[PDB]
Design a protein around this ligand. Structure first.
Ligand code: HEM
Ligand code: HEM
Ligand SMILES: Cc1cc(N)nc(CCc2cc(F)cc(CCCN(C)C)c2)c1
Ligand SMILES: Cc1cc(N)nc(CCc2cc(F)cc(CCCN(C)C)c2)c1
Ligand SMILES: C[C@H](O)[C@H](O)[C@H]1CNc2nc(N)[nH]c(=O)c2N1
Ligand SMILES: C[C@H](O)[C@H](O)[C@H]1CNc2nc(N)[nH]c(=O)c2N1
Ligand SMILES: [Zn+2]
Lengths: 413, 408
């Protein structure tokens, strides 16, 4: 592979040079003959597999703190090595764990918000043993992160995988989500995305209110055991009713959303250790709710209903009645959130911030992996600075990975 | 391997077998992906390239291994042998150009690929002949508003020394003038080229929408200026359906989109001059041309007349300004019976086209980065459609700008 690579910005002619792609660890899916850049998704580790993985991470950590080749560095290596040799695994120091989680965020190519990567609160929950213990740690995460609307990014990290039969998993894809109920007539109430999971919850014992914005319970699995339901204290779930600064009728749509974006189905990998339960949270970009949650045809799909109340021509597609209703929904989402002092970033600010971030990364780190397909907002793309930015995408470790859905793999006791 | 693509909205899955047929590299490796990078012969090189092409021609017409097929291979062989190149049959020229359109991973219009009008201009020898050939393309392809797809093909490369090149990247584009005060009149994307025309003796009207003259190079010779007759250049006054103040903005665009700087490649032959044209997707003009900061840049101005709050980015004034600008663009073309496709319709057609391609051809290369409209992305059905990109041949490829390699 070639040493230096170039990326161009076609709006500013700025040309950056990427040396970091050389440290790529795993596969992208692409080959010389085919590219999978638009493809969404392209039993444990043995000793000899783990040794080099771990050393790589350690060396990396000691090169960050400017102690590479030091006495503490070589001594750490020998300790880690002795530990894999005898126990088939090892354990990360609190320092290593915190560096590793910040660095998996920093390396997350699909994430437009990584300018904040270094400010992340890491909650070590490796001492956990039960679902109640999990429910407790998560509740504290929610309360810390939410901070009364002044959100703060945090991760809570549960015990790492051992033999595969003793995983900790959060069964909810995200900590806070709205239920979805299939009707007998085929129509759906709530968030259609979450139907399968809502059914699981109901079978597992949940009594559903059967409403449009019913907050799902946590379903928590510890040490390989069957999952258990716990409801989140509603006082811990900050929520924003959606109104519009011009249209008085917009609140009549009875729309709200949750203030905390919190991913709980991804696997954090550090030094070859697998953290199968590692919920993290930040704050929302306006478009996530205004465009995807609200407007996607298979989600809340309110475009037609907002169009009606706007009195738009809806026969001709070229009237652009859809794009007009879309902008106005996203105007209301940013308005509601700012007026309740809940932290939220518009897609112009975020993309501008990210270009800044990327440039500093190229400067200081010799590169910054990025997934243009994910990075570019799902509305008004070309009018944001990232659209015109060339981005090399590759996978650096530590990283956040996808993992199978637990209800597909779990062995019921 | 077979590969699968899923649409995440409909959950439809398609199976790609076609990708097995490509050979050209994409740029990516198993470790680095360049899906967002814009720009990632001899007798012995020439024959197998020619052979594969003929093979798939005679396979597409269901006469594979025929006597017709066998002599063609023989004909082509003896010809490369004794001439270091070979000429395409007319049937093969037409197939090669339609199929190069068909393999254009970055084109959303490809549902139309087979209704391509093909203009053979391989008997051309001067810049004057080119100009006459181009005028005819423009005039046919414009057709009084009812746009039709066409391509014109000038003689193939031979030795690099005698290349045919249209120097305009597009047959019709507005001029760009640098001002003493730093700013730019006309089109800022064209400013260099405009000054190469002026340097060649073009008299610029120094205006915001001055059609640039043709700069044609024939057989490796110096380029020569030529004005397209105005009656062949259809343009549209851009006006708004509800905003009666919009016309006062002074916006017009040309009706005919026509890329003239690329390079058609068939059976290992290089047509360095092959202007093709179809019709516009509204966003091409409404978003990119008018609203990029390095283009016409009118969002500030429009949102002013629209009287929006322009103090904070989070009031999404740009996103409002943008939608109204694109409404006008569609409404102007439609009102003038000039062909245009909106991005909702062009995307639907594409998804339908993909279905067709998979169904009968086992795949359809697509560049998601380019296929997704530059506005309202996820409310079009292609945002949610997974696409595989790979380079099938014949293809349209890029080439060095002429003024970087030509000696006078
Ligand atoms: C601090 C505020 C943050 C903002 C504004 C932000 C922004 C975003 C956005 C808009 C997306 C796309 C979401 C989607 O389309 O589903 C995303 C994805 C992602 N973000 Fe962030 N993020 C933030 C914090 C974080 C943190 C704290 C982490 C990890 C520690 C993280 C890691 C990721 C990852 C791994 C993805 C990809 C998700 C997937 O593949 O499904 N982000 N981010
Ligand atoms: C007939 C109606 C057509 C429509 C609606 C259409 C639409 C589009 C659009 C919107 C783009 C993106 C270009 C940009 O944003 O810069 C594009 C690209 C492209 N189209 Fe089409 N097109 C049409 C006809 C054609 C024809 C006749 C050809 C060739 C025979 C063609 C081949 C291509 C190629 C090669 C690109 C890639 C441009 C590049 O790489 O710079 N298209 N098309
Ligand atoms: C950490 C973080 C910050 C931020 N601003 N946004 C996120 C994503 C939040 C989220 C919240 C949510 F409810 C669903 C999703 C993804 C749904 C599945 N995808 C693959 C189609 C994501 C995460
Ligand atoms: C054949 C065709 C059909 C159609 N609807 N649109 C096109 C492109 C028209 C066009 C016309 C034009 F003047 C410039 C461009 C893009 C120039 C390069 N970009 C990346 C900075 C494109 C071509
Ligand atoms: C098929 C395609 O990859 C898929 O629809 C992607 C496109 N880009 C995206 N970008 C973001 N940020 N989030 C998404 O869910 C998607 N979806
Ligand atoms: C860097 C990136 O490749 C560049 O901004 C691309 C993105 N997608 C595009 N898509 C179209 N249709 N036209 C373009 O010029 C671009 N530009
Ligand atoms: Zn790729």
């Amino acid at each position: 592979c070639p040493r230096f690579l170039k990326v161009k910005n076609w709006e500013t002619e700025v040309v950056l040079t990427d040396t970091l792609h050389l440290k790529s660890t795993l596969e992208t899916g692409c080959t010389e003959y085919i590219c999978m850049g638009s493809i969404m998704h392209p039993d444990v580790a043995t000793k000899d597999q783990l040794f080099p993985l771990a050393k790589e991470f350690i060396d990396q950590y000691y090169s960050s703190i400017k102690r590479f080749g030091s006495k503490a560095h070589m001594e750490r290596l020998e300790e880690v090595n002795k530990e894999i040799d005898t126990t088939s695994t090892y354990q990360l120091k609190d320092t290593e764990l915190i560096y590793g989680a910040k660095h998996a965020w920093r390396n997350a190519s699909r994430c437009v918000g990584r300018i904040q990567w270094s400010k992340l609160q890491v909650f070590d929950a490796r001492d956990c043993t039960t679902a109640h213990g999990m429910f407790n740690y998560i509740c504290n995460h929610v309360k810390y992160a939410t901070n009364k609307g002044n959100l703060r990014s945090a991760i809570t990290i549960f015990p790492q995988r051992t033999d595969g039969k003793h995983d900790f998993r959060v069964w909810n894809s995200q900590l806070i989500r709205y239920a979805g109920y299939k009707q007998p007539d085929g129509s759906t109430l709530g968030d259609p995305a979450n139907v399968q999971f809502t059914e699981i919850c109901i079978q597992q014992g949940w009594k559903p209110p059967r409403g449009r914005f019913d907050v799902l319970p946590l379903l928590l699995q510890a040490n390989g055991n069957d999952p258990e339901l716990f409801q989140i204290p509603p006082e811990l779930v900050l929520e924003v009713p959606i109104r519009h600064p011009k249209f008085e009728w917009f609140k009549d749509l009875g729309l709200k959303w949750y203030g905390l974006p919190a991913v709980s189905n991804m696997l954090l990998e550090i030094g070859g250790l697998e953290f199968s339960a590692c919920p993290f949270s930040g704050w929302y970009m306006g478009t996530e709710i205004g465009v995807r949650d609200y407007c996607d045809n298979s989600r809340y799909n309110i475009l037609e209903e907002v169009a009606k109340k706007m009195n738009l021509d809806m026969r001709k597609t070229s009237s652009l009645w859809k794009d007009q209703a879309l902008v106005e929904i996203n105007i209301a989402v940013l308005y509601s959130f700012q007026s309740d002092k809940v932290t939220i970033v518009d897609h112009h600010s975020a993309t501008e911030s990210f270009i800044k971030h990327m440039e500093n990364e190229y400067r200081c780190r010799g590169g910054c992996p990025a997934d243009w397909v994910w990075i570019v907002p799902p509305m008004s793309g070309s009018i944001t600075p990232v659209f015109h930015q060339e981005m090399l995408n590759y996978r650096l470790t530590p990283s956040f990975e996808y993992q199978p859905d637990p209800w597909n793999t779990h062995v019921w006791k």
